Amino acid sequence: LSLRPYEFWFVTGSQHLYGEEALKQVEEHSRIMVNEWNRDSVFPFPFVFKSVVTTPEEIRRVCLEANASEQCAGVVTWMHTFSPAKMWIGGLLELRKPLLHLHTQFNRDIPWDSIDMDFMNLNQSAHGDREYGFIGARMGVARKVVVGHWEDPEVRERLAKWMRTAVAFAESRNLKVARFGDNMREVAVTEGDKVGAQIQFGWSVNGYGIGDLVQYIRDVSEQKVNELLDEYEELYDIVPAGRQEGPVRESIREQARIELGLKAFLQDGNFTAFTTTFEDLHGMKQLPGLAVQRLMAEGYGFGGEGDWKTAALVRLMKVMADGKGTSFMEDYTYHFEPGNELILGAHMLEVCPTIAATRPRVEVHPLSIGGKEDPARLVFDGGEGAAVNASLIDLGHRFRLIVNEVDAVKPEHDMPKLPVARILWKPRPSLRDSAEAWILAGGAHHTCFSFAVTTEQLQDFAEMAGIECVVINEHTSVSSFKNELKWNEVFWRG
Amino acid sequence: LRPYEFWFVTGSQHLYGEEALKQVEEHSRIMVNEWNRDSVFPFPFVFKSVVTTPEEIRRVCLEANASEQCAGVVTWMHTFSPAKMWIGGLLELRKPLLHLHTQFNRDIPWDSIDMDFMNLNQSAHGDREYGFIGARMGVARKVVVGHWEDPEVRERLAKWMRTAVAFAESRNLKVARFGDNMREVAVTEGDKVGAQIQFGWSVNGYGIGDLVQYIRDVSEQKVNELLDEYEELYDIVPAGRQEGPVRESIREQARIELGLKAFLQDGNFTAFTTTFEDLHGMKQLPGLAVQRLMAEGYGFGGEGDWKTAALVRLMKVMADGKGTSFMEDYTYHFEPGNELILGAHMLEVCPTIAATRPRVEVHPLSIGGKEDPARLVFDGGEGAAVNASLIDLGHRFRLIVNEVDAVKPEHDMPKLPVARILWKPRPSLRDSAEAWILAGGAHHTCFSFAVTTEQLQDFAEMAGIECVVINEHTSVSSFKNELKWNEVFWRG
Amino acid sequence: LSLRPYEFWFVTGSQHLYGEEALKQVEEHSRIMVNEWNRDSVFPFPFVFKSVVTTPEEIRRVCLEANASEQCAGVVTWMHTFSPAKMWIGGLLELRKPLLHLHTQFNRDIPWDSIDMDFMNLNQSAHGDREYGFIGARMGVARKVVVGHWEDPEVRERLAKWMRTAVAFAESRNLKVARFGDNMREVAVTEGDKVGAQIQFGWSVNGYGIGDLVQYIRDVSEQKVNELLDEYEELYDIVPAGRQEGPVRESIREQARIELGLKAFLQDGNFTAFTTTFEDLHGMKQLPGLAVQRLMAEGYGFGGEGDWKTAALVRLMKVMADGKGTSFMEDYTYHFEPGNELILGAHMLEVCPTIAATRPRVEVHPLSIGGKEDPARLVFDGGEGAAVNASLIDLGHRFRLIVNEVDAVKPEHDMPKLPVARILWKPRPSLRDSAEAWILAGGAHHTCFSFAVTTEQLQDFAEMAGIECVVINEHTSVSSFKNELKWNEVFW
């Protein structure tokens, strides 16, 4: 599931004060930087040099162009020289693409023996970016600020990380979610204001009768079903029962039909995320399981029980990710053994095989929930490593993003009676403290779980989107966490 | 409705002795007794004790909370009744509250008035000290001033009773949604959790398939009996009186009506929604069936509009008479000196607002892509009415109320396959619509002949939401200003 | 003076989804936990199991009951399984009792060999308590949250401490203060809004003429006075000139009349706290001293100079306390010796003997303040140990609770000329910084000192009462403290 070709516009500020020659040197420096950056594979998207801007008219034009350009995912601005910031007001009011203020300098060191006035006029970001910094603060603009020399690998990795965050925000603005059925009845945290969500994030979330999907599923050709089954056998272990014709294999074959129906429905409307609900399965033989797991492994957002917020978050995080292993997740049960406290996460069927440590196995087991036939699903253990667990909730008058940093651990023991894929992890700073913090922030039971998204990225996304982001990690103290929630509350209100 | 009652609670104090307190109790008992003899009141009064200590006050407020029949509490300070004693109970009370500022005797007995009289009949100041604690605490309260035998006073009280019972119904209201919101529509979206917190409404989704199963279980005998009732209540189109396709269309609505009814009763719902975008397993869009359930007093909202469905149900309860419908502004008549709005829906207008006698008709309806639906066709009556919409502003709800005058049509509308009503909105079409749009009023409404503006304002007061009114006194420039000033008030 | 018994209601959330058999195991688990907890002596009050709730009605009913039961001091809720949180909205709107969310699990470990879908459906507090956590945050409920296994001793400690806090809050809601005389003239910090405090905390604070107390004292029988004197002799060292007959025994006898008169007045009115004032003592032979010190030893709240806020606070902390040693207190003078900085605390007369480390002696000395005769009082040195010093002030629009953690120390020198009881402490993080933070927070000069109340309890109480609680302890830096005062202020 691939992306339009995003790029990043590099805009360099200056002024006419010092003459035309100085301006040429500024332009030369900026082209060199863009050229050099583009050759570094740390960056996942190209930079494009978008000129030296020196007048209010220039600045506004490039902001206007950035807004209208679908491939422009973000703008990086750097004042090479002093660039009077009243000139930037028109542009900053216009721009609605994510903005990064790069505070840098072409040369690394001061050339002591030769530094003179011309040099001082030329290499003066030291004050040019401060004046630009002021107008940003003054206008209350959302901005990433990065400080450092432009060949410093730390600086580059921060830009590169930000690029993925900025791209996910472009995807967010155009995200379409399809709901097959409504929220699980009586459930609170999965409910919310869709209109409010479309305003804050750009998400278009709309409902379809399950019958609309049943229709697509009934148009699936058996030939394609057969091919898909072959692929299943190449990629996964199959339970012995399903190896030859008979009822177990027919159940697997049914999920194959569901997978193809979904893929078709979702592609036809250009949806990149979807929800189902076990409370509305009219005309289906099974709750989608294997089928949803496969679609998640291709990067679709998914949320159980009509949970569109998590479905959206899962898709965003898939785009943010610089690597494998992102999934819809739900905390299921705890292990409270002193000195070895952990959480077992899973869902009744739907966990993404990208987080798997072991070769996934196709199994068929009864599932009374939903009152349908025994669904086929992938069963596997999650891998180990540092990860984030994130939930996005609706507080009524605004949204809150909650992120827990965790460490997934390998299971030491088999769970042979457990028919679902699952993962274990120890939340930071402890089970007790993170759970308490989580509950105090009202974090959901559904999350996006990812080995490949960082806390900084989620916080950057929240800035772009104009919402609160709270983090629970190794440094968290519950008492300070509570105060922060109160103080953040007054700030984000209204 | 369930049985409802209203608690009269009289305040006093121990200062003037035990005999004084017996006299205030006699007065309070007599008032309740006389009130109960008057037909103006839709529910009975219950005399609760005279309360004179914080414990008694708190105890009666707790009981009112626990009592499902108690729809509201009417409080009156017969004598001075030190208001700190009232803090505890007011902190606890979750039933609507009316402060009746009244007096047993109407006139000052000039020739005999003495200090005993002055100690006993001093609501003039007792109710003011109580009024302070109400304001000081920010209690939502209705305040009525006048003598307890004044017909205006009783009439005000009786109307508030209806509002308070609507509120009690609101707090237990269950809506069933068959299918989701019409796709891409904004005004009918909103936060169900927020709504359950604010009004008590329970809004939950079911597959259209859940309803189909019910419709399929309908007794064919029951259908035939219902089909006959139709023949008796309505003018059926000629083609429909004989066996044939048309009569079969009418028969389908009968099955739909019976299946809906059964579903609703099973889950004790009093409002429901449908959407034409999700009718898998259905032969037609519910039409005639919805119109009848609306006549029985069910709330309904088209296109998954749960806010409107609940509003419709609420107003059906507030109403002291006939004629309450889900409604949508469909088209304008901009003829100078005769501007009006024609309201209707695809099918679903309530026959309780009919002037004429409803005709059962069958016409093609391309919306939803199902078979020709049977429905009741009629003209709406004439009269003063209200048209109300309840919207979600993101952080809070806003109730919007336009006062209007319904008018009988002067020209026939022979090609128009749906029931309709015509109204002239106060103060004019141009200003009413401008105000409605600035307030973000919805296209879906509840239209009623039998609900007053006062009632809707009292309900909004009970629920803790803004109520914006558009009437003959409305000026748009002023109106715009008040939205701003209200905004800063109701903003959390 | 003795504390009413209370209980704690344990309610467990579940749902119908998994069938009746799973609901039976939920109930079995919950019964087992309540039974096992009630065997554990760490809990000062019992749990009562109050059903597994699975519908909006059940949830609503049990919160309504919880509200109306005077024996119920708190509710402890645990979602054993997923328990959809819109069902909880109605009950949460109803509950005014303190609420603790216990995030626990019946089994401590995952049974790796056995775990299957049944187990996953049953023991899913991991997500059920999160959905529940959301609705509490979404609705802005004041809640204590405790996480860990139900057999973890630390978990049980936390629940236990909170039980005492919750019981102090119940007492708070019914607390009645008697004031004998007004505030000391021109004093600011002891003044406040009594109405606002009754709304916020529940306290009833009312004034009586000193003459009222005087009538009670005059009614005391001399026989009782004689018996009280014998108890003085048995509990305390009496100054030798006081054991004989004469003026100073007569002075001790006069304090015993006051004690008995006071005790009788307070009991007749159900008061559990009181204030006196040296400026209004008409009819009294002495400023109450020994008398007050004895009432405080019984657990009565006291505040000097008409200070009702501290009197109330002292009483609440007496209830909160899980051990001996709680007193009204005033910083009187400093010791600025380098490396040995400390505060000497005392009052005119009134320091509770429960903080004493020496056996109190009954002594008689002149007191010019008040213009009355030489009062008898108890004299002693307070003991060493970690404690808190707390003040509650009125900022005009809201209350602020201020708590300083301190370390009481043994005096190295006798104070032979000092006629009052006293205690020395070293405030955290240092005298200089502590005092600066205290003054910035505007903390009173009158406090409640206690060896037996934790900061966590006072913080939990403030949360129950909906007020700011500022803590000054070893970690305080003044600059950071200033910031938080500003940020808290915008929130509150």
Ligand SMILES: [Mn+2]
């Ligand atoms: Mn789930």
Ligand SMILES: [Mn+2]
């Ligand atoms: Mn419509």
Ligand SMILES: [Mn+2]
């Ligand atoms: Mn003092």
